[PDB]
Amino acid sequence: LMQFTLPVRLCKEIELFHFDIGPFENMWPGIFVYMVHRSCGTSCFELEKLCRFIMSVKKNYRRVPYHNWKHAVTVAHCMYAILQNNHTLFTDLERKGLLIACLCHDLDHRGFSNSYLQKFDHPLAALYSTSTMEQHHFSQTVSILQLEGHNIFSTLSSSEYEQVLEIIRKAIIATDLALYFGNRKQLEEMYQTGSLNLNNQSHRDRVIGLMMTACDLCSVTKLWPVTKLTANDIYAEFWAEGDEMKKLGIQPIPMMDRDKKDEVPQGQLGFYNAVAIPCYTTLTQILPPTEPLLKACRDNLSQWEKVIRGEETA
Ligand SMILES: Cc1cc(C)cc(-c2nc3cc(NC(=O)c4c(Cl)cnn4C)ccc3[nH]2)c1
Numbered sequence: 001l002m003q004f005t006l007p008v009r010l011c012k013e014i015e016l017f018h019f020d021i022g023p024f025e026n027m028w029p030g031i032f033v034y035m036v037h038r039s040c041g042t043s044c045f046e047l048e049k050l051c052r053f054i055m056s057v058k059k060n061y062r063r064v065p066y067h068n069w070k071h072a073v074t075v076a077h078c079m080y081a082i083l084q085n086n087h088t089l090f091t092d093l094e095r096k097g098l099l100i101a102c103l104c105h106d107l108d109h110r111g112f113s114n115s116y117l118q119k120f121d122h123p124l125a126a127l128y129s130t131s132t133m134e135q136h137h138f139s140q141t142v143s144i145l146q147l148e149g150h151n152i153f154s155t156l157s158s159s160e161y162e163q164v165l166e167i168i169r170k171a172i173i174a175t176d177l178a179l180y181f182g183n184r185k186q187l188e189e190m191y192q193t194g195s196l197n198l199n200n201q202s203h204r205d206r207v208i209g210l211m212m213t214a215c216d217l218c219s220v221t222k223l224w225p226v227t228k229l230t231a232n233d234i235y236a237e238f239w240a241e242g243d244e245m246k247k248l249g250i251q252p253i254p255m256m257d258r259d260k261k262d263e264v265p266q267g268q269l270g271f272y273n274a275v276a277i278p279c280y281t282t283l284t285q286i287l288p289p290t291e292p293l294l295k296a297c298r299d300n301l302s303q304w305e306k307v308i309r310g311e312e313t314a
């Protein structure tokens with residue numbers, strides 16, 4: 001057989017939750033196959049169809065500052081780390097489906113939120129009245145699966161194929177941050193009343209949803225230099241959207257106004273308290289080995305505070 005292998009440094013550090021996939025685009029497909037071969041197994045997919053699928057997916061991500069091909073592999077890598085450190089808890093089909101859901105979760109993103117598509121009256125907002133982009137991302141994933149030589153799930157039974165597609169659909173829809181608040185609340189009560197049951201399929205759904213939020217925000221869990229540099233790319237998109245809101249004659253919300261550039265450290269602080277810390281806290285309670293995500297989230301919170309008090313620049 002042919003085993004994908006990585007250089008020594010990458011081979012060690014890819015197992016850490018805070019691994020950065022680096023600036024060489026041409027290595028990301030190789031990194032993703034390696035992660036699939038070690039988390040799923042070398043017999044999960046025909047190598048030739050996986051490669052055709054990977055490259056069709058890459059080709060349907062856009063040249064946008066943040067919601068691009070590098071984000072896709074980064075989110076997939078965070079899922080790899082979660083799966084490797086909790087390997088006794090997941091089914092054969094869940095391993096297969098979740099790295100693929102992560103790779104495809106932002107297909108054909110143009111760098112605009114669901115809210116801008118509604119104010120613009122984009123045709124996708126007529127087709128899909130909630131989770132607008134996320135429903136488009138899934139639809140794009142099915143298109144790609146149905147290309148000739150691209151059905152990476154060709155060996156599955158008709159009913160298994162339907163299950164794995166249902167795992168993928170739910171995990172992608174869960175990346176709509178508007179649904180995260182509800183999902184985490186439900187999971188916090190279920191944890192703290194002892195009702196949470198991983199053999200309950202609609203509970204599994206909610207846990208995987210939270211794993212997708214954790215993976216989609218994982219830039220807040222990297223070393224500080226990655227975290228800070230990645231925040232430029234995020235605001236680059238947010239501010240282009242806010243410009244577009246202004247063109248419609250609408251005042252954008254604050255995070256999307258490039259005039260409020262100096263309030264970023266405080267906005268970050270707000271985001272960590274209201275969203276990130278709660279997310280990684282609830283995930284640590286449910287999956288104790290994910291601890292290092294929350295630890296690094298706290299370190300970076302502490303760094304945003306240094307920036308507010310002028311002991312650090314950005
Ligand atoms: C200039 C300014 C002013 C005010 C009043 C607020 C903000 C402000 N900045 C915000 C960023 C996020 N989210 C993220 O940074 C994010 C996502 Cl989403 C994924 N990963 N990350 C890291 C959410 C809410 C935010 N409010 C900004």
Ligand SMILES: [Mg+2]
Pocket residue numbers: 105106133175
């Ligand atoms: Mg998205």
Ligand SMILES: [Zn+2]
Pocket residue numbers: 071075105106175216
């Ligand atoms: Zn994303």
